[PDB]
Amino acid sequence: YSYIDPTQLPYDHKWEFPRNRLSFGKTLGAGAFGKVVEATAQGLIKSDAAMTVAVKMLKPSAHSTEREALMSELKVLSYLGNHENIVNLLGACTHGGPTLVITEYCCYGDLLNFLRRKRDEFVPYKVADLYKDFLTLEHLLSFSYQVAKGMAFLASKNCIHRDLAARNILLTHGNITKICDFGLARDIKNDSNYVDKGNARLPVKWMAPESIFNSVYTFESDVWSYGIFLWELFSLGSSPYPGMPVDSKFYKMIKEGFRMSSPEYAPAEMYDIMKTCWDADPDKRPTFKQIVQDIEKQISES
Numbered sequence: 295y296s297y298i299d300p301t302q303l304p305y306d307h308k309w310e311f312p313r314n315r316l317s318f319g320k321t322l323g324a325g326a327f328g329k330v331v332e333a334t335a336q337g338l339i340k341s342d343a344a345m346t347v348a349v350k351m352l353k354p355s356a357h358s359t360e361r362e363a364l365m366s367e368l369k370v371l372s373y374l375g376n377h378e379n380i381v382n383l384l385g386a387c388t389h390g391g392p393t394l395v396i397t398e399y400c401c402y403g404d405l406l407n408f409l410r411r412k413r414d415e416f417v418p419y420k421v422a423d424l425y426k427d428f429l430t431l432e433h434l435l436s437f438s439y440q441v442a443k444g445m446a447f448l449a450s451k452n453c454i455h456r457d458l459a460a461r462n463i464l465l466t467h468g469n470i471t472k473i474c475d476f477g478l479a480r481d482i483k484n485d486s487n488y489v490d491k492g493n494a495r496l497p498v499k500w501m502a503p504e505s506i507f508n509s510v511y512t513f514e515s516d517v518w519s520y521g522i523f524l525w526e527l528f529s530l531g532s533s534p535y536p537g538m539p540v541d542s543k544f545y546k547m548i549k550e551g552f553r554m555s556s557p558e559y560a561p562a563e564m565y566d567i568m569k570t571c572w573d574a575d576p577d578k579r580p581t582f583k584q585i586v587q588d589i590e591k592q593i594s595e596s
């Protein structure tokens with residue numbers, strides 16, 4: 295559970311929304327047991343106008359474990375409340391059928407795919423041509439700032455993410471990021487970034503050593519994952535530890551202090567943050583609040 299028990303968190307019934315007022319559309323993503331579909335919600339706004347949303351729900355393949363996980367997810371999201379760097383919960387459907395979790399629809403998709411389709415036209419300094427929506431260094435700095443602020447908020451609410459990575463960051467217009475957790479709606483079975491370890495399938499390359507070797511998730515283990523996320527960002531969407539399978543050698547090398555080199559586009563001061571995030575001692579890692587103050591100053595001087 296880490297610090298808080300989600301089952302004990304309350305569900306504010308102000309979120310409850312009539313499920314008959316949702317019309318399901320295309321599936322945006324799906325795992326073994328859950329999925330996220332695009333939908334239109336009628337009467338979500340005071341005007342009769344229907345607005346587009348995203349809905350997370352379980353599949354008929356799901357078991358009692360996944361049913362509780364989705365309800366626990368809803369409790370956590372309601373407990374967190376609205377925050378600008380987090381995907382916006384809009385409503386939920388809890389009675390009259392299965393649990394539905396309704397969030398905003400983010401038009402530009404996940405950050406990892408965004409980085410990969412923008413990689414070839416990346417601009418390190420200035421854009422002449424503005425209409426092309428070229429990815430810039432200024433954008434990457436802002437991305438890392440917004441995600442750090444979002445994680446500082448989660449930390450202040452005693453919430454551990456456990457799967458922070460570019461694939462779990464959504465993008466809206468103006469290059470605003472929203473931290474997400476697609477969880478059961480991601481096909482982790484066939485995603486090479488998740489690795490068999492014991493009876494589970496885990497994002498090992500994003501995980502801190504203490505998490506790998508004794509399944510502990512802390513404030514500080516999320517900070518490790520953030521450092522890996524920065525490497526993704528400033529490599530423009532590359533997979534971490536390239537050409538290096540997850541095996542006994544990988545775990546040994548990480549435990550003995552091997553760390554990635556700086557990605558091709560990382561400012562030296564952003565790489566400095568990565569190295570501290572990857573400190574073997576979790577107490578020497580920075581906090582998300584400290585990371586926010588660090589990046590803020592970098593942007594000032596940019």
Ligand SMILES: Cc1ccc(C(=O)Nc2cc(-n3ccnc3)cc(C(F)(F)F)c2)cc1C#Cc1cnc(NC2CC2)nc1
Binds near residue numbers: 348476
């Ligand atoms: C519908 C939905 C429901 C829930 C979430 C979600 O993130 N839940 C979440 C859960 C936990 N949690 C805690 C404990 N157990 C789980 C923690 C976090 C947080 F905040 F900590 F990160 C979040 C996301 C969506 C979505 C979407 C969507 C996809 N695609 C596009 N658009 C692209 C172009 C097509 N837009 C929107």
Ligand SMILES: [Cl-]
Binds near residue numbers: 354355
């Ligand atoms: Cl199914």
